[PDB]
Design a protein around this ligand. Structure first.
Ligand SMILES: [Ca+2]
Ligand SMILES: [Ca+2]
Ligand SMILES: [Ca+2]
Ligand SMILES: [Cl-]
Length: 294
């Protein structure tokens, strides 16, 4: 569908740190949240489908996309709680109102699902895909990259990620079924061109995945939003992927129990937005048109 970004980046100061985001259009928000190691750019070919249906917003997580890096960065930085502190503040600053449709992926789903549980009256609908829908076990993690993710969560992670940029350069293309162009890869590597701490968010994220009980704070937060989503009547759109990657097996079985949910299946592994953007955008736009009838 293309390498051109959607709209233009806007910036706003949050906790003294300039965060970047796309905010196009008017009306209630349709809020797209990327995860690791992507940015608002992940949604560039999906957001056009929602033209005219709302205020289309896609924020770049702190340390990612065009958002500022945290300094001094190190292994204690960019944990989920820190990301949430910045993202909650940015969402508050954007004056989103009380009928928000969340469209989430990967860490964007952990953050969005948690935000939704804490601001449930303001959530009109939730569309999710390849999400972190609940705490998992290593047996639930996809086999292809299980050893690599165990390595990220070990002392080997700094060389793999900070030195060699393995998340951007290997994991990202490895979990996209079609070949990316030069320009698309340039957009993904841009925030991470420099070796070292600039790449820290892409290492801190896998170390935060609630797997086999650790980190316990994130396991608790995900246990909470999992229980809440399993009971919430808020309309949901589950965009399942084939073969998919993270939302397969037990997690997919659990997601399929969620109430008031519509599901479509699109081709893709993990970064399914690069494989089936039109199918995904058409589904999201249809979900929003149903939630916002004239
Ligand atoms: Ca209103
Ligand atoms: Ca292993
Ligand atoms: Ca590939
Ligand atoms: Cl991750």
């Amino acid at each position: 569908l293309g390498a051109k970004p959607f709209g233009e980046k806007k910036f706003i100061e949050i906790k003294g740190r300039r965060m970047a985001y796309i905010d196009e259009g008017t009306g209630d928000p349709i809020l797209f949240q990327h995860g690791n190691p992507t940015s608002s750019y992940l949604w560039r070919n999906i957001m056009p489908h929602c033209a005219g249906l709302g205020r289309l917003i896609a924020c770049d997580l702190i340390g990612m996309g065009d958002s500022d890096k945290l300094d001094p960065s190190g292994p204690e930085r960019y944990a989920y709680a820190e990301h949430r502190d910045y993202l909650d503040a940015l969402w508050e600053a954007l004056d989103l109102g009380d009928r928000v449709v969340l469209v989430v992926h990967d860490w964007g789903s952990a953050l969005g699902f948690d935000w939704a549980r804490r601001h449930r009256e303001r959530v009109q609908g939730i569309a999710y895909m390849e999400a972190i829908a609940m705490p998992i076990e290593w047996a639930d993690f996809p086999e292809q990259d299980r050893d690599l993710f165990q390595a990220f969560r070990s002392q080997a992670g700094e060389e793999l990620v900070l030195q060699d940029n393995v998340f951007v350069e290997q994991v990202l293309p490895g979990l996209i079924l079609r070949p990316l162009s030069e320009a698309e890869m340039a957009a993904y590597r841009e925030p991470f061109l420099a070796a070292g701490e600039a790449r820290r968010p892409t290492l801190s994220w896998p170390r935060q995945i609630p797997i086999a009980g650790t980190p316990a704070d994130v396991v608790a937060i995900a246990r909470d939003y999992a229980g809440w989503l399993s009971e919430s009547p808020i309309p949901k759109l589950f965009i399942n992927a084939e073969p998919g990657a993270l939302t397969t097996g037990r997690m997919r079985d659990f997601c399929r129990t969620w109430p008031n949910q519509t599901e479509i299946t699109v081709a893709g592994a993990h970064f399914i937005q690069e494989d089936s953007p039109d199918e995904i955008g058409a589904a999201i736009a249809a979900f929003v048109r149903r939630l916002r009838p004239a």
